[model samples]
Target: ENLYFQGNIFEMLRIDEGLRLKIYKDTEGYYTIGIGHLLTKSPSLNAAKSELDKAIGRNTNGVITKDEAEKLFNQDVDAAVRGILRNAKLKPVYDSLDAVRRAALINMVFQMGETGVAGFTNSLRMLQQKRWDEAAVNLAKSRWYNQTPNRAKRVITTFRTGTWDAYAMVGVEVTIDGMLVLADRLHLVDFPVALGIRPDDLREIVWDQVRRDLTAQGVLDHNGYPHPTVASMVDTLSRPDRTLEARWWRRDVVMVRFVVARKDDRHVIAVRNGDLLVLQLVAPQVGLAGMVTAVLGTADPASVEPLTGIASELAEAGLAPTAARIYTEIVSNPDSWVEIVASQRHPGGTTTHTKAAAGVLDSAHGRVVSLPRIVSGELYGSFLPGTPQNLQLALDALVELLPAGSWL
Candidate 1:
């Protein structure tokens, strides 16, 4: 039978000290750290009490009474951690992995879970059988392949060579390190532009290239891209009249953006492309607009400005009057334009216009629409089905209308 322990139990503990210090400095941070510790540690009840006191002393400028710290810590730990970890237990899966491989696997399992461990089961069996080459290949064929490509590569290299040095050279920061680097570099204005592409295709090319680069860099799976959440969100916004596209703007640069469109609604989402950007019931919405207003409002007639170029070019291409109208509205008031466009029926007339607007918003909001401020009170005032459930329902309705293979 395979034995397993919490893959990164020790490493998890090691990071806790730093994380605790960072978290305790703020109220939310304090609660996060307290919950984290309660879940991971086996301290005596009294020692846990003392730990809370010490944490409060250090973080709250010694203003927290011992009783107060103890009460808050106990409440959160028992209510949050104990319940969360009820079914969680440590199991040792392999005799022991090389430290580097272990570190990489730990990050993988942390993101995924024990069922995720099965992804490597075939590889482990191969290694146990001493079929090193085949085992290496099996190890590479994992969901981890979609996550830390470079680290996965390094692990495969070490597995094949029976040496840790090769893996060590690759470094271990976090699973999404490559993606983070790419995102940071691409967002910079000084990034260069290359030829052999239309101005419109430039952005699309960048997005495509970035996804490919992420695959090559080991930040994405060789078979698929990362950020399924973003993909799923995009899919929810899908409509016959709209499309979604993504790309990398510069080689070796990580900046990624998702360009989404649905009839009159079109906008680019930057800096929130990866799996880590997940939030409950709402994705980030930055610099979004409808197509019609986006184009007509452009002050530059040259069609070269970053913001207006695409809409202007499409207009010059002699698109239909409705297309032109949509683009014109985008230029004037992209946000308001969505309301207008969504009010119109689709070609099939099966869905209403408001449905379209809401669909685009659902996609733009990353498949998680926040309750409008007006409805927040009513939405949150329930126990059986709360805000999250309502959001999910809205998402499901929109998703049903999208084209296939369009969802994340």
Candidate 2:
């Protein structure tokens, strides 16, 4: 049976949003890098049209307004679509993908950049040469794979087998929903500490911070989650047969069997945290939104402290002392802590909070007073209170306090 296009689109949007938020957090959104840059950096849709208009206006020595650029951008999408359809191999794969998946793949191609697909080109050649396993391996070896490890693994698995059956199974959806729910829970408890920030953006910040800290300590990479080991870890997460095993720094795991009954043909993903639960309800045309208030009116304060503690420790180690100190203060504050409640409450504020924190930490005031004395002297002419190596050790200690399995 064909996978539902709308359903796939909903899923794709969630994934896209997640990835975008991650990128924004990594760069603190100050950098010009975006999803567009990650893909092809080509001005394909709207961005392309703007460029063409600029070129034409320049040729005329400045005749067109910026509005003309938008109009030209509107036309570029169709032209780009036509150009892609002209390719036989690409056309088949493109046609097979649902609209959501198609858009995602296009975005991925754009992010990977056209030349980066050379690995995929070779993989296709391998497939044509009937070297299926080699094709799969080659596909996974691309820079794109390194750039988006989890997603690349999924796509390669589908391509080599000519079967998306594994991901298509009902259990896969359940697992994704469960994971998302857990992610949301983390957002709730930890987000408020990064007040004035959006939950999605906050998630990225925390992930990036943790990743950086782990990398410095030789535990993980800049991705925040454990690397090399994550592949096997994800396997455990994806499998329904396995039970969740708890460990230090790993409080997100839970093993529970529950019934999922379709009451009114609504598609739903639910996650329960004690008496509190959150549900991402997707409708046929309405798209996706978290029906959080419906499931739990207000999150428990008691439940949030542990998660905040984890966030604090991770932040302290991940960021430079300047950034780390500010984050530590924010997480420790009571009144300024409600920002991480949910995305609906605060839209684009996470980046704002991060920038604010980083600015303070890097400032003279922060460097001298707030940042640990081991790293630098006190603010307003205080001396360095401890050895730099000791300060480093202290930072490592904070990171070690973070709960492990809480990360993606």
Candidate 3:
């Protein structure tokens, strides 16, 4: 039934164009947005966030929720189909084919648009005649084929085989998309084993791995037109016998960084070393009490130094950008830190230590530099599954950096 490949269609689209949160200009230079929908006109900010939330599968204010993202994938696919049906000229013949193969026309239409499909007179008619082989060969010989031979080749394979997913490309791509979609789908737990996490969560953290994997194998690159090089990563991951999950699940590096922007009136919220309070992002400040109530949430405002704070104090003492440079570096510290402890610990022993060498890392990224010991020390190059030591590395990195609380 059409319901079967309904999933394949969704995954293929997701892998073809990675999910996004917050409205943004797609690389295509369009007011591109939502699970990859392009808009000729811009949507309102509220509307944009709404759309972003829709695709992510959650109603929360946070960027994404796993459950909601997967739920809306169906709507996105349905929207794609609605676009396809506007001119499914070979409707009957198209229906007669398996969901996997039938997806070819729907996909062709999605990728090329109706005008392009109309131009494919020969390929379109071939489907009507139920000429699978002829349709595939003809489709392969066209401009679209030569243009993206790799993509076309796989699609062509789908056309030729009664069961293309039975091979690698489709099934694999679809499965991966589905896997990530589901990852954002639910939280079934017994510790981290509990499934369902935001897909964007992985998108943020594992992106380096995405770039790394794509640069390595069967998944070819096209200088990244519509999507970034990450698209290729998914293509390669869709292959059988893949080990993407195994490596990603490892506890080697834990880097958490994000800009907490909140417009005040509700003004700007200051982040002391290690403190991460609620940013005045969308809503104006309710009041002062509501402000500190946001708390450092889970950060240690007592950890790192506020860089070149007391700028006048420093410049008068004559620091070089002592006025400007130190001024820039002396912003608040991060509530996040890399979890790089590389060795195993006693199953039941409890010990504590602080990071020996402490420094402020870019809140956006921290290169896992195989650094060192805490109170209950261990190596930290291959990081992550750290339950205890990792916490303090994050918590105590500040103890070493800021001896006397915040600068204020």
Candidate 4:
């Protein structure tokens, strides 16, 4: 398994990460020296090899020997193992996996590094949960796949089948959502994370097709980012399926999700799905000022329902009526809004604001800390859900709610 491991890797054309020397502009023209002895991709020097940096004693005119390459392979592979083993939480689940699957995980960790792998939060959780189809789908739906189509096809096959088939996608059938699809029919793109841009954008991407789909494919292939330059992605979250604050996803839907973790109460989420100017706030147990305090205390969607009645009251208090309506509509229909938007689950909990208060209050901050836990003026930053008028409507209401308290 020792030399075989090294030799096998070289065959994939992937071990370049294990050993390679710098030379003429890689097809992309970037500096490309790393672990592998004989590698490809990245790093190209304009000058002669005499000036390239190397161990002065073992200098071989920039070319490393095969023996040296094997040494490099071990270190690279070892780094991958440590990345997985380093996580105590990941071990138990990892142990349950097959040898080929183990290799697949390590291979990714080797290339992406621990932190980069961590960025695939939405997928890893599925991998850990042993949700075979879901995990496979999540992996296939990433920029990683768009960047390296062949790698994704093989890696995904390794997960679905216990065997590592380098040639896995000759005519692969990926079943998702209890459905079968032609491998060619699958659509993945790198458009804006917005669940959908225009109604047309929404129409182009039937959410069901999202299963086993690819991301960042939106922009890379066609239709481009946000599906259109004007649209942007927003966060979608929920309390169902144990989602609450433990996971999240981004979509083209115009609405944004605001995760409000109160000081002593259950985590409360506010969603602004669509314009509320036409919709009026319904009945509630608490008003704006009262709802603020209610939010700081643990709350559920039903509990927040009581707070939804205060939009008109917000206007009565002098914030723009548009802002009050838009803000309260989300407060009122958080669950309903979440019903339409979609994407894989993300992980996170608390915030600089609540984390500070969470320490003082024992009951608060009891959820998972999914990386990229966002809490701010914008749910998915850099993109506003609606026009300036609508934002002003929400902003004015938010200002009024500011005194509602930080921990809320």
* Residue-wise C-alpha lDDT for candidate 1, range 80-130, written one tens digit per residue: 323323423212323344454444444344334545655566776665555
Best by lDDT: 3
Q: Rank the candidate models, highest lDDT first.
A: 3, 4, 1, 2
Prediction-by-prediction clash tally: 38, 19, 34, 44
Instruction: Name the 10 consecutive residues with the lowest summed lDDT in model 2.
Output: 352-361
Worst 10 residues of 4 by lDDT: 356-365
Clashes of 2: 19
- Give the alpha-carbon lDDT of every model: 0.34, 0.32, 0.38, 0.35
TM-score for all predictions? Answer: 0.27, 0.31, 0.39, 0.33
Best by TM-score: 3
- Model 1 earns a TM-score of 0.27
Evaluated against the true structure, the overall lDDT of model 3 is 0.38
| TM-score winner, 2 or 4 | 4
| Model 2 CA deviation exceeding 4 Å by range | 1-14, 17-107, 127-134, 161-408
Candidate 4 Cα outliers beyond 4 Å, as residue runs:
1-10, 13-57, 88-93, 167-408
Candidate 2 has an lDDT of 0.32
lDDT head-to-head 1 vs 3, winner: 3
Which digits, one per residue and each the tens of the lDDT, describe model 3 over residues 116-203? 7778778767767778899888887787876655557767767776553422222112223233432222221111111111235866
In candidate 4, position 242 carries an lDDT of 14
